[PDB]
Amino acid sequence: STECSNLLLQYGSFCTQLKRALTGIAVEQDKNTQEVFAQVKQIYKTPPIKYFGGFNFSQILPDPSKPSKRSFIEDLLFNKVTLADAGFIKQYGDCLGDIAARDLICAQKFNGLTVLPPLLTDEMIAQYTSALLAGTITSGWTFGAGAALQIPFAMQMAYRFNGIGVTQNVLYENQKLIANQFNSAIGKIQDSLSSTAS
């Protein structure tokens, strides 16, 4: 409406600073995601051998069968949260369809409200998570302090046990029990994510 626009022009620059605040929020969200996930400089990958001292990381390492290289637990977490599509893939094309059931997103888009897509897609977040997991498994804490230095996983867990104040012979004489307890804990994480919805 041209008359409403000509009357709204007399109210100053409320709209411009409103848009500036929303733009600052939109940039801040991408900055938050980048400063959380993009913490590693190189994309590490797991070697094709899958033995790590008896510890089983099959549920957190990515599965190459799916088009989105996500793990099993990541797929469970993505399936549990009922995220709306938020008008990403051409919302005006979908709102032009002759359907009697009108959506709320179509009313939001027709009344001037738009949702912008994030800078990092979910595949890139999964790649960053995979690189962090590969570096943590195959190098320990060295990859966060320079170049990644390889070490067997049993020796790394002995270093962690020495860090918490336990002698490494406790690990080396109880390695299979600790591996079985870790695998049972991962299976309990599976069952609690598949069962509990809260």
Partner: protein
């Protein structure tokens, strides 16, 4: 005049609300800077990626317009080499574990070194300890242990 008063009052309240939100953000940043001054400068920090990237050694404060600048002095390992490792050493039916460091091998002889720098030493009863026998630890190798 009532119309102009209402408009200018709304503009002033908008400015005050934006200033309050920015004051909350600046207070959070100043609390982080105070924590970094107390931990990076007044001591040595073991927190990873707090007080710079790498193993933290020192920190220096510098003043700046509306802020502070920390010069973080850190230690970075440079030139890595491959060695053959083992969890323990089997000797006389006894399993020897290192006190501090790691067993390494350069192909023929086995030494004990520290983890963050390559300084090999002769494996001795002073720098190792004995716990159990040789049929429990997976990956144990055979070597003699020197006795002074």
């Amino acid at each position: 005049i009532d119309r102009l008063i209402t408009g200018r009052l709304q503009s002033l309240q908008t400015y005050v609300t934006q200033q309050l939100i920015r004051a909350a953000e600046i207070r959070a940043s100043a609390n982080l800077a105070a924590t970094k001054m107390s931990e990076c400068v007044l001591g040595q920090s073991k927190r990873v990626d707090f007080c710079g990237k790498g193993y933290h050694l020192m920190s220096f404060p510098q003043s700046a317009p509306h802020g502070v600048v920390f010069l973080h002095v850190t230690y970075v390992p440079a030139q890595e080499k491959n060695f053959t490792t083992a969890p323990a050493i089997c000797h006389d039916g006894k399993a020897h574990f290192p006190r501090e460091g790691v067993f390494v091998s350069n192909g023929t002889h086995w030494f004990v070194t520290q983890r963050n720098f390559y300084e090999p030493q002769i494996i001795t009863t002073d720098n190792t300890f004995v716990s159990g026998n040789c049929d429990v630890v997976i990956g144990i190798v055979n070597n003699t242990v020197y006795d002074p």
